[PDB]
Amino acid sequence: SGFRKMAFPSGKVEGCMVQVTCGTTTLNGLWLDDVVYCPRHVICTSEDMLNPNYEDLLIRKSNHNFLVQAGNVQLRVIGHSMQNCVLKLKVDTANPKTPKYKFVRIQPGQTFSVLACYNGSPSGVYQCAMRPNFTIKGSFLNGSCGSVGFNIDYDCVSFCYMHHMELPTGVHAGTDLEGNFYGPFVDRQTAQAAGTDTTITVNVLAWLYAAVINGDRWFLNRFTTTLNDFNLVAMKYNYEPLTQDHVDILGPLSAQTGIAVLDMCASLKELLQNGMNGRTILGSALLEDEFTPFDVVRQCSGVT
Amino acid sequence: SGFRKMAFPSGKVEGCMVQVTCGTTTLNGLWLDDVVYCPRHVICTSEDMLNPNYEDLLIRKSNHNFLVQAGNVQLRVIGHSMQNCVLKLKVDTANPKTPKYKFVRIQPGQTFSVLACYNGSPSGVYQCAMRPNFTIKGSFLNGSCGSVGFNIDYDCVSFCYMHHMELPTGVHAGTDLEGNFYGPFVDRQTAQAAGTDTTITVNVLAWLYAAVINGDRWFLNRFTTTLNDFNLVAMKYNYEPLTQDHVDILGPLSAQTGIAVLDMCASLKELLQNGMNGRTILGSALLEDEFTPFDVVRQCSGVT
Numbered sequence: 001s002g003f004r005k006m007a008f009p010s011g012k013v014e015g016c017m018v019q020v021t022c023g024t025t026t027l028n029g030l031w032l033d034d035v036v037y038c039p040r041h042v043i044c045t046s047e048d049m050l051n052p053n054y055e056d057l058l059i060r061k062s063n064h065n066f067l068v069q070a071g072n073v074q075l076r077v078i079g080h081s082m083q084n085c086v087l088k089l090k091v092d093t094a095n096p097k098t099p100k101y102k103f104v105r106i107q108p109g110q111t112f113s114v115l116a117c118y119n120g121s122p123s124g125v126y127q128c129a130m131r132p133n134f135t136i137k138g139s140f141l142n143g144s145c146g147s148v149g150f151n152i153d154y155d156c157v158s159f160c161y162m163h164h165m166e167l168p169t170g171v172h173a174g175t176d177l178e179g180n181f182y183g184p185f186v187d188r189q190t191a192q193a194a195g196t197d198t199t200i201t202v203n204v205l206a207w208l209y210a211a212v213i214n215g216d217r218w219f220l221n222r223f224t225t226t227l228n229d230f231n232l233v234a235m236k237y238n239y240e241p242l243t244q245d246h247v248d249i250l251g252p253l254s255a256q257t258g259i260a261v262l263d264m265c266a267s268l269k270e271l272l273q274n275g276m277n278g279r280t281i282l283g284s285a286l287l288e289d290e291f292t293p294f295d296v297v298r299q300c301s302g303v304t
Numbered sequence: 305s306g307f308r309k310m311a312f313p314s315g316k317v318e319g320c321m322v323q324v325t326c327g328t329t330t331l332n333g334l335w336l337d338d339v340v341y342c343p344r345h346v347i348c349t350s351e352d353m354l355n356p357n358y359e360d361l362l363i364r365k366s367n368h369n370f371l372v373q374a375g376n377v378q379l380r381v382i383g384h385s386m387q388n389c390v391l392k393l394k395v396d397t398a399n400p401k402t403p404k405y406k407f408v409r410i411q412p413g414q415t416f417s418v419l420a421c422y423n424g425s426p427s428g429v430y431q432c433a434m435r436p437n438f439t440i441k442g443s444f445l446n447g448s449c450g451s452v453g454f455n456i457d458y459d460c461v462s463f464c465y466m467h468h469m470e471l472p473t474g475v476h477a478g479t480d481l482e483g484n485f486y487g488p489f490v491d492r493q494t495a496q497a498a499g500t501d502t503t504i505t506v507n508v509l510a511w512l513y514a515a516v517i518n519g520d521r522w523f524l525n526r527f528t529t530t531l532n533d534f535n536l537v538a539m540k541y542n543y544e545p546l547t548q549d550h551v552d553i554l555g556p557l558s559a560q561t562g563i564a565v566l567d568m569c570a571s572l573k574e575l576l577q578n579g580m581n582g583r584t585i586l587g588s589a590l591l592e593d594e595f596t597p598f599d600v601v602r603q604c605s606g607v608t
């Protein structure tokens with residue numbers, strides 16, 4: 001009973017967080033095996049950020065200029081390399097708390113947990129979605145760079161995001177763990193446009209199924225629709241076009257509730273055209289898009 | 305930038321979770337030092353739950369009937385005792401992962417993180433508030449009993465809640481770590497009424513300050529009010545009466561934004577009387593009451 005914006009248990013990721021300092025800039029690093037990963041802008045001063053030449057800036061640095069502190073003890077840096085927008089610092093000690101892990105690049109519309117950190121220490125954990133425009137609406141202040149996003153499948157942590165930047169609009173941008181930015185962003189202090197965002201249609205449908213499972217059914221109507229008709233409405237309301245791939249992953253929820261996907265699309269169509277009329281669904285007065293079909297299945301079945 | 309429903313990092317609590325089995329009933333236990341804490345209904349069959357006599361039921365049990373498994377290894381039970389609605393199982397081994405901890409009883413309207421667990425394994429973490437009627441609107445399925453709520457102050461985990469029961473309305477009830485229920489509930493399979501709930505006024509005000517800090521200011525108006533006038537409105541909308549104690553803890557937010565508490569009460573008054581008019585505040589179309597003034601200060605300053 002009940003449905004919450006649940007994050008993964010952050011324990012496995014907490015054991016990997018370290019503080020990385022280079023010059024007078026300090027941020028967070030991810031220590032997996034004998035490598036510490038962090039945003040390459042750790043080597044920049046505030047003035048360098050205006051128009052950095054990272055290759056030239058990194059050439060002035062040596063292994064002894066990167067200070068890595070894991071909790072209370074100091075790690076010895078025996079190598080350094082830049083991969084895209086991340087720095088990889090080779091250390092002489094493998095992290096004894098390294099969980100089973102993978103580096104994955106998530107698709108827009110997928111969700112993940114963020115462990116927000118400052119000075120190598122965790123402050124909080126929250127669940128969010130990668131927006132269709134490749135930004136994340138996080139909660140990050142200065143010093144939070146190097147904080148990571150992840151998913152967990154039983155004992156394996158799949159790291160998908162590393163925080164790098166706050167756009168002038170207050171939304172956030174970052175990279176995968178190979179240092180490739182999500183979206184069109186660059187690690188530079190320059191105004192950068194994030195694309196037009198849209199609502200993650202499949203996620204709203206998954207969340208409407210979670211509402212039915214937990215007893216919120218007032219929005220169910222006597223109508224149905226077609227993919228074409230629904231997509232005409234989705235376009236008018238800046239929702240992502242629904243595809244047969246989206247219908248396929250909603251199948252387990254359709255099977256559990258007996259509500260055909262296209263019948264749920266007709267309920268979504270009426271909510272888009274009429275609004276909530278002062279009512280709520282799962283404690284929300286808007287259509288929630290940060291739960292994927294997989295998240296709803298996992299939460300509603302109790303997967304640990 | 306940004307404001308999220310952030311939970312505490314759950315690492316310290318994950319290291320304490322164990323599985324407790326007695327007969328054919330399995331639930332979660334909390335292993336701190338050489339004691340495992342769990343709901344006393346672990347000793348009941350489904351039929352016993354109709355009208356349990358816990359003293360008589362516990363008399364038929366011996367130390368060897370309580371199976372405690374911490375991850376993969378079995379703990380040896382050398383003592384058992386019932387304290388209110390919790391069972392305390394003395395084990396021959398102190399948990400090597402015991403964090404610095406306290407047992408605290410929280411007041412209604414306070415917030416905390418829940419680490420939802422099944423069979424001793426963590427599935428997710430979420431932040432919630434203790435409702436003024438002493439229920440929590442969690443996300444719990446069968447097997448989640450023994451999952452705990454907590455807060456963390458630097459290195460100290462203050463355990464405040466242990467999950468015990470799902471009411472017929474789908475809301476949740478539980479105890480402090482001394483086994484005293486929050487609210488008028490009893491650990492019995494009988495329909496039980498939770499009081500009339502109200503909105504946590506001080507929390508909504510704290511969240512309106514968080515919105516101002518992050519740029520959502522459309523709801524600020526040219527008006528002010530008095531505690532008496534505001535409380536007339538709060539009563540009409542089933543909001544908790546605001547006291548000078550509530551005003552006192554909102555002071556740091558009033559100081560940061562320069563918006564007097566009573567001026568913020570006047571904005572809240574207009575939002576209660578007029579609604580949001582199809583607009584949102586911090587990504588919400590309703591007035592959010594699950595962030596205390598302390599949570600907003602902590603999140604907006606980056607406390608780790």
Ligand SMILES: Cc1ccncc1NC(=O)[C@H](C)c1cccc(C#N)c1
Pocket residue numbers: 039041049140141142143144145164165166167186187188189190305
């Ligand atoms: C201030 C702040 C708040 C939240 N998240 C990140 C930040 N910090 C930043 O955005 C830093 C100053 C920055 C500036 C320009 C480019 C990059 C990159 N990549 C990083």
Ligand SMILES: Cc1ccncc1NC(=O)[C@H](C)c1cccc(C#N)c1
Pocket residue numbers: 001343345353444445446447448449468469470471490491492493494
């Ligand atoms: C089914 C379920 C879902 C979520 N949370 C708890 C539960 N489990 C329960 O509420 C169990 C069956 C129960 C029955 C009656 C009294 C107590 C107590 N104390 C416990």
